[PDB]
Amino acid sequence: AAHLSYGRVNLNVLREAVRRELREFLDKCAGSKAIVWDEYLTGPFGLIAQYSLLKEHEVEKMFTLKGNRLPAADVKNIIFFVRPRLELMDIIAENVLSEDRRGPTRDFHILFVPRRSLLCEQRLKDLGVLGSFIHREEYSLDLIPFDGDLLSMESEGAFKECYLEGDQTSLYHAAKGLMTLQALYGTIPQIFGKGECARQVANMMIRMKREFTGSQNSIFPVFDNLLLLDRNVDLLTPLATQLTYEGLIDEIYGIQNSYVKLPPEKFALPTEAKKLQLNSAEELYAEIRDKNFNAVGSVLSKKAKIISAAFEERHNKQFVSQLPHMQAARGSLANHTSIAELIKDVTTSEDFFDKLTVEQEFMSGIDTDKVNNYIEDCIAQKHSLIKVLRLVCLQSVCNSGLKQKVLDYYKREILQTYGYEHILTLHNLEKAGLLKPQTGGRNNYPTIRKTLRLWMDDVNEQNPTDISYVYSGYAPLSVRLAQLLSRPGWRSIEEVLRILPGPHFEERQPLPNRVTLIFFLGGVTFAEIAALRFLSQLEDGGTEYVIATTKLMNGTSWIEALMEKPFH
Ligand SMILES: [Cl-]
Prior knowledge:
This protein has helices at residues 12-28, 39-45, 51-56, 86-97, 118-127, 158-164, 169-185, 196-210, 245-252, 283-288, 296-315, 319-347, 350-363, 373-380, 385-399, 404-418, 423-431, 445-451, 477-486, 494-498, 526-536, 555-560, and strands at 5-6, 9-10, 33-37, 59-64, 77-82, 107-112, 133-138, 144-147, 150-152, 190-194, 225-230, 255-256, 259-262, 274-277, 504-508, 514-521, 543-549. The protein has a 7-stranded mixed sheet, with helices on both faces. By secondary structure, the protein is of the alpha/beta class. The protein is globular, with a radius of gyration of 25 Å. α7 (169-185) packs across α8. β10, α8 (196-210) and β11 form a beta-alpha-beta unit. The site of chloride ion has 4 residues, from α9.
């Protein structure tokens, strides 16, 4: 996939490597196979291999781990592709013991993704079934390539686990994934971090490299720097409504493993959602994904002319060959013209204007300490709980928590309107720093905002000059910190760093335009990603970013992962 290779970083090396380990493991379970999938893995895996590849290695069937009895199927092998979690082990046992004895015996194998755990195998041994697996194995799929500059773990629970449950299991896998990167792309000489989770990943990287027993890595470093950042250092950014094209698509429809599902009417029973893939392989999408949504119209018009001219030339040799490209480019323009229309419908409603006014009030310091009328109206009209929670948390973070009278008012109305089950929800938002009572000390956020210029009025959305174009005024704190690390360095902002959570550090790993790998521990938004691509294309900025994350998220999916499964 050509799009996985952007400038100096060729992420096919990683993808081709995991695609090879997969083949090799499938060959090891020789004879026909059915894979039983932990549901959560199916989507992410799609980015590594499709069914076409698995068929090549005699995978004749695929089921979802449901439990009870496995469907019959004349295969020699059954292979569980499961995450190392205990709940699932119990379900796996049901399957092994629910074996129909009125058929031929099917051999059982298990593939832990990304790797086994001690606790799990104890569950299987205690349940009896441990001894029934021929091959127990692991498939070290940690960082998944989503695009040429983008990798994700797609580990949804990671934020909740680290910040609420005292569980740093995801950080270990992150460190592991960084080792895999280093083995293919060279050791990363310089490590910088800000955050508690970032300190831990650093420590683990350094220890693991200490503990390495292979032949010597003789690869010239692709990445000059690693920057590890705790999501909880910037809790504001995900709460805000993203205003880039890709961000809006994600906010409204959601993008899952690089695909989106859209109302099908404008495109070409029941009629299934129009399913589209969204990454940089589609030229037009590369040109618009990162733009403020108000800039997209103009690119669309320009594309129309470029297409007409291509046909006008073909009207008056090489054009037989470009024609399959030309047709596809019209189709692409037609697809994104329709999406833009779907999005413009959302973004020109009165409710959207009002929400955005409030968000921008909070982000720029206005009335962050009083009960907000619009939020009250949304509650009274029983708008989506998540939208309400996003706003009350946005308020709380811009204010460093709320006074008692105001926090209590919001909790009582939320509980009364959406139900008392949401007392778990509010407890979690407080433990996570999102919606809390203030201390009655000074609110530090204004100092940070001013000093790092996080809010600016009347920003240019058509030809941006600053990272704030992605939220039409708010410069993501996270990206701003990346920017200032690169120039003029974090010593010039020591006072601000000290009033942000956890330590800031640097470490050096010894070796026999800079590229910086930036790793968001606890999630990253598409808007933040757009802003980092903006930094990478400034001629002056002297740093290009490759973005890594535990999870691609938005404020809606972020807060949902802090709610108790299942929903109402
Ligand atoms: Cl929206």
